[PDB]
Amino acid sequence: PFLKGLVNHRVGVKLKFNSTEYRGTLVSTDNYFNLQLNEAEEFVAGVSHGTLGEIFIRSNNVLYIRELPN
Amino acid sequence: PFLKGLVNHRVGVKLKFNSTEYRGTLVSTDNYFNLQLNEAEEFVAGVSHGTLGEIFIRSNNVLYIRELPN
Amino acid sequence: LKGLVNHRVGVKLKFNSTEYRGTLVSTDNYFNLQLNEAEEFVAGVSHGTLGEIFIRSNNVLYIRELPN
Amino acid sequence: KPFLKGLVNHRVGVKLKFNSTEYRGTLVSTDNYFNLQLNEAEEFVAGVSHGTLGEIFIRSNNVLYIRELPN
Amino acid sequence: LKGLVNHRVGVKLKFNSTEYRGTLVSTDNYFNLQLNEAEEFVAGVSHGTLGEIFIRSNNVLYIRELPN
Amino acid sequence: VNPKPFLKGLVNHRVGVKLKFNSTEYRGTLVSTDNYFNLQLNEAEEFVAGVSHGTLGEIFIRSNNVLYIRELPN
Amino acid sequence: LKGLVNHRVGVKLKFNSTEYRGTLVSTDNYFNLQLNEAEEFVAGVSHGTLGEIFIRSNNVLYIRELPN
């Protein structure tokens, strides 16, 4: 259970392009890396550009995912 | 599935190359992320650029999908 | 997607404000599609009539139903 | 199950994503993959002939679309 | 590849001379890997420490083992 | 019993493998292949603008980068 | 591809005109390869020695055996 380990945890989704990162609670996923983020907050350069709701992010745009410091 | 949850909801599909977002009622979908929108309205930088009928969007172009709130 | 066959549609190419309009003869899950009486549209101006075309998904952004 | 099959032995135009290049020829064979064989191939750039290539085998990816060339 | 599990490796992305270093926790044929105590390196300068990161193959150029 | 190599005929023939980017062509003998368009070229000569840029031995090419393959001469 | 295992090969990337030279330890049917004693060559010049590297298929242009 590689990716499932992060469910119900607060993570940072970083994209390949720009320095953009979505931070939120990782609702659901799938091997495909397609993921579901709740209470997602958009971060640019480490600055908040708002809160998006529940977003479904597609794998292809993802560089990597991290667990947000408790 | 993953996106079956949003069916019949008003959602925003955000593309990966421009500040464009298509808004509408997600009629149907599939794992491949390929979605059909109803009452689609194109949004550029947050500005309506008019209305397309029923559109079918190809996953590949999709950055993420959120649920529209009002 | 089959809900549009023999309907007048527009196939929007991702890369440049180019959209092919015609009737959607046939398709398949793959988003590869066959268009009839294709008309290529640049920034919404016609650039002539292509015959029947068989287009490749990958180049497609979206497909919409052309009116009335 | 074959897709385009209906153009085999037809005079068609294979247009590429980048460069207004068009490879015109007859189609030997094609498979669901859109990878296709072309006979008596003539490269076209902007509507101009830039020569003739033998028989070519094209890779789907670089293909925007295919059309039937007017009899 | 599983030869590197519990190994200090370095992940080099395709774009931009950015390498992620840390211990290779787990992986799979898909090249999608987990990295523990990752440290972002840019042009071979530490840009910080990411906690545990899960990387997507497609961004990866190559992986190497960090020297003893 | 259902699928086979659609490029079978060119094996051991003098071909030209053209890439998507540049105007680089790799000419050689088509050693082997596979539906995947992944091919083994023997006596591979790098061509740029129809100009030789030396010779590469046996090369193993990847389909992705390949625009099209053609048959070189009699 | 297996015909190169334990051979000295040079791997060519699509983007920089820079090649990875080394012993081809392993490879699977995905074009991903493990290279031992990798040396990185830029426009024909050596820019250093990487240890063991596992290279991802997508980045590769082509593979050749070496006149050593």
Return d(Cα G14, Cα G6) in angstroms, integer: 24
Give D60's DSSP letter: G
Across the interface, whether the CB atoms of D35 and F6 are under 8 A apart is answered yes
Of C4, C31, C65, the CB nearest to B58: C31
Q: d(Cα C52, Cα C38) in Å, to the nearest integer? A: 6
Residue with tokens 């290049």: D21
- Give the CATH architecture of domain D1-71: Roll (2.30)
Distance of CA F8 to the CA centre of its chain: 13
Closest Cα to residue G41, out of G65, G22, G63?
G22
Residue that is written with structure tokens 């498979």 in the block: D31
Instruction: Fold for F1-74, please state it.
Output: SH3 type barrels. (2.30.30)
Which residue from E26, E52, E59 is facing A63, i.e. has the nearest CB? E59
Which two structure tokens, joined as six digits, stand for C8? 């007048």
D57·F69 Cβ contact <8 A: yes
Asked if F48 contacts F22 with a C-beta cutoff of 8 angstroms, the reply is yes
Residues 6 or more apart in contact with residue A47 via CB below 8 angstroms: none
How far apart, in whole angstroms, are the C-alpha atoms of residue B23 and residue E6? 46
Closest CB from E60, E61, E65 relative to G51? E65
D68 CB-side CA count, 13 A: 16
What is the gyration radius of the CA atoms in chain G, in angstroms? 11
Q: C15-23 long-range contacts, Cβ below 8 Å, gap at least 24?
A: C15/C59, C15/D17, C17/C42, C17/C43, C17/C44, C18/C42, C19/C44, C20/C50, C20/C53, C20/C55, C20/D65, C21/C66, C22/C53
Q: Let me know: does C53 contact D34? Beta carbons within 8 Å.
A: no
DSSP states of G23-61: EEEEE-TTS-EEEEEEEEEETTEEEEE-SSEEE-GGGEE
Can you read off the two tokens belonging to residue G64? 């050749």
**D30, D2 in Cβ contact below 8 A?**
yes
The CATH number of domain E1-68, selected from 2.30.30.100, 3.40.50.2300, 1.20.120.330, 3.40.47.10:
2.30.30.100
Chain G residues 16-45 with CB within 8 Å of chain E: 20, 28, 30, 32, 34, 38
CB atoms within 10 A of CB D13: 19
Alpha carbons C59 and C44: distance in angstroms, whole number: 18
Task: Please calculate the CA angle A12-A22-E62 and round it to the nearest 5 degrees.
Answer: 60
Q: Which of F37, F4, F2 minimizes the C-alpha distance to D61?
A: F37
CA pair distance E37, E21, nearest whole angstrom = 8
Q: Where are the domains of chain F?
A: 1-74
Q: Are B17 and B43 in contact (CB under 8 A)?
A: no
Q: Is D10 helix (H, G, I), strand (E, B) or coil?
A: coil
d(Cα F30, Cα F44) in Å, to the nearest integer? 9
Q: D4: number of CA atoms within 13 Å, CB side?
A: 29
Alpha carbon of F36 to those of F28, F33, F64, G2: distances in Å?
Answer: 19, 8, 9, 16
N-term to C-term CA, chain D: 27
Residue type, G35: L
- Neighbouring chains of G at 3+ CB pairs under 8 Å are E, F
Asked if B43 contacts B56 with a C-beta cutoff of 8 angstroms, the reply is: no
Find the residue in B nearest to A29 (Cα): B2
Token reading at C59: 């180049």
Which DSSP state fits E40? E
Q: What angle do CA C25, B62, C29 make, to 5 degrees?
A: 30
Q: G60: which chain F residues are within 8 Å (Cβ-Cβ)?
A: 62
**Which candidate from G30, G50, G59 shows the least CB-CB separation from E64?**
G50
Closest by Cα among B15, B18, B23, B20 to B67:
B23
CB count within 10 Å of CB D21 equals 17
- E7 shares contact with chain G (CB less than 8 Å): no
Per DSSP bridges, beta strands C60-65 and D11-16 are: unpaired
Three-state DSSP state, C58: helix
Top CATH class of A1-70 equals mainly beta
Determine contact, residues D67/D52, Cβ cutoff 8 Å: no
Residue G52: C-alpha distances to residues D28, D66, E5, G31 (Å)? 46, 45, 14, 17
Residue B31 contacts by C-beta under 8 Å, 6 or more apart in sequence?
A: A32, B1, B2
Query: What are the b/e assignments for C34-68, b being 16+ CB within 10 Å?
Result: bbeebebbeeeeeeeebbbbbbbbbbbbbbbbbee
Residues 6+ apart with CB under 8 A from A35: A13, A26, A27, A28, A29, A56, A57, A59, A62, A65
d(CA B58, CA A70): 37
Per DSSP, the three-state class of C41 is strand
Yes or no: say if C10 and C18 are a contact pair by the CB < 8 Å rule: no
> Are B53 and C67 inside 8 Å of each other by CB?
yes
Method: X-ray
Q: Does F10 touch chain D if contact means CB atoms closer than 8 Å?
A: yes
In which residue are the tokens 């997607």 written? C1
For residue A8, the tally of other CB atoms under 10 A from its CB is 10
Which DSSP symbol is given to D48? E
Residue B23, both tokens: 């808004």
List own/partner pairs for F47-52 with CB under 8 A and 24 or more apart.
F47/F16, F48/F22, F48/F23, F48/F24, F49/F23, F50/F25
Burial class (CB in 10 A: 0-12, 13-18, 19+), B53: middle
Question: What's the 3-state SS for chain A?
Answer: CCHHHHCCCEEEEEECCCCEEEEEEEEEEECCCEEEEEEEEEEECCEEEEECCCEEECHHHEEEEEECCC
Please, is F47 exposed, middle or buried when counting C-beta atoms within 10 Å of its C-beta (0-12, 13-18, 19+)? middle
Burial of G34 per CB tally in 10 Å (0-12, 13-18, 19+): buried
